[PDB]
Amino acid sequence: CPLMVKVLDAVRGSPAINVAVHVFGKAADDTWEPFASGKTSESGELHGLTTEEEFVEGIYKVEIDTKSYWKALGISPFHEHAEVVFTANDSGPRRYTIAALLSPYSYSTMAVVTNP
Amino acid sequence: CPLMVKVLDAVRGSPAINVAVHVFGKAADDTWEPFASGKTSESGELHGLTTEEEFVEGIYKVEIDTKSYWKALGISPFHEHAEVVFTANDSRRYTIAALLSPYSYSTMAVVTNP
Amino acid sequence: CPLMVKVLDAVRGSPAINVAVHVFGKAADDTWEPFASGKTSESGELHGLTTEEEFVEGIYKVEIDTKSYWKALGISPFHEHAEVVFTANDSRRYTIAALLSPYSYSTMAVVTNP
Amino acid sequence: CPLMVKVLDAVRGSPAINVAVHVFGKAADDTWEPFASGKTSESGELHGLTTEEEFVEGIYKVEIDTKSYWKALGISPFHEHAEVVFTANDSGPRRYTIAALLSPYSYSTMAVVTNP
């Protein structure tokens, strides 16, 4: 698991379950192209998005669908989504955990990067 | 104004108004003793807590009474209060900000120079 | 002033000065097009981006060029930039704040009323 | 594990390793008394602090020694420590994960509370 995404809900003190996540790579002509997608589990975690072989070096965007999450809970939030844009694997393969802590009008995001 | 406290509400996207804030200095016997207090204004800010003369070097605690803020809004919160503990050092204006959610808070210190 | 951006540095405890900020509106073909831009001031603030007349309802993106800020400080950062995407809605002043660290950021929106 | 503490370093993008943590309970006369202590592992996590039987209902304070953490890395930080004060187990036993994301002049803390 070279890429994992973890999402937490700061209103409820719980994993944020069933949150849609779309990952994009920047292509040769500098457009975003779809790379992987999935939804968080009951643990708030999304594993299995990619493999070490497919996750080549480049710029990636992880878009977390926070607006649909909040609306289904009765809340009209500020953000359309949370976006995390970063260069990956440019010094060789790494493992990335992208965490997001969500509130209706704010979010915090953190990455942990490790070398296996 | 050596010390200012700013509190924001991440559920409503607004200042956190009428939040009680207590500041304590840490004394000889090493116990906390009240130093200054107030309630945040409509802008979520609390000015006028202390003076340059009084705010000497030492360890201070700022307690923000977040539980009462959430209770008044009908929202079950996790923490009893948020606590910010730090040493003042002469080299300054301290702005202590806190962003509140029911099960999380973020706090930041901006230290700036005259 | 319908829109203000404030950027703070959690490594130094200071405003984040001279940070480039780009705002985009999201147009017909659904592409992002430049709307306003500027650099944060010595207080970490960027005022004057748009007007009430121009800031109509719609989806906007604020991109804060955090990578260049950290590079100028000699600190290896994680993100290319921080992005804040939201819909403006008539019912208002928007303050978008971002607290920066090299591998994390927090962002908050304060929406207030005249 | 009714109580776990996880600490992350936002300067380095890594677990915060070997961070001292002291937990206190509020006693009958309303003084803080020592309840448990430990240090974070290489994963940034501190497990084994207490048992369901010992972790009775009450007010607890988790003090994370962030100042010593930063100083050993060459950084003179703002806070003496990060403090997390909460009532626990007052509606029956729960499991608490207390997370803290650390920077030199800021921290964020989040709790996830689950019912086993």
Residue numbers in the entry:
A (entry chain A), D (entry chain A): 10 to 125
B (entry chain B), C (entry chain B): 10 to 100, 103 to 125
Please quote the authors directly.
To test this, the dimer–dimer interface was stabilized with the well-characterized T119M mutation by generating the double mutants R34G/T119M- and K35T/T119M-TTRs. We took profit of the fact that R34G/T119M- and K35T/T119M-TTR double mutants do not aggregate significantly at acidic pH to solve their crystal structures at pH 5.5 at 1.5 and 1.4 Å resolutions, respectively. As expected, no major structural differences between the pathogenic mutants and T119M-TTR were observed, with overall Root Mean Square Deviation (RMSD) values for the Cα of 0.24 Å for R34G/T119M-TTR and 0.15 Å for K35T/T119M-TTR. On the other hand, in good agreement with the molecular simulations, the BC-loop regions (residues 36–40) were remarkably affected in the double mutants, in one or both asymmetrical chains. Indeed, putty-style cartoon representations based on mean Cα β-factors show much greater values in these regions, pointing them as the most dynamic in K35T/T119M and R34G/T119M TTR. It is worth mentioning that the higher flexibility of the BC loop in both chains of R34G matches with its higher instability revealed by the thermodynamic analysis. The contact region at the tetrameric interface of double mutants, which consists of hydrophobic interactions between the AB- (residues 18–28) and the GH loop (residues 105–122), was preserved. The presence of Met119 keeps all those interaction residues virtually at the same positions, which allow the formation of key contacts in the presence of the second amyloidogenic mutation. Gdm.HCl-induced equilibrium denaturation revealed that the double mutants exhibited lower stabilities relative to T119M-TTR, all displaying a single transition, with midpoints Cm= 4.3 M for T119M, Cm = 2.6 M for R34G/T119M, and Cm = 3.2 M for K35T/T119M. Although the crystallographic structures of the double mutant variants were very similar to that of T119M-TTR at the same pH, greater flexibility of the BC-loop (higher Cα β-factors) was observed in the presence of the K35T and, especially, the R34G mutations.
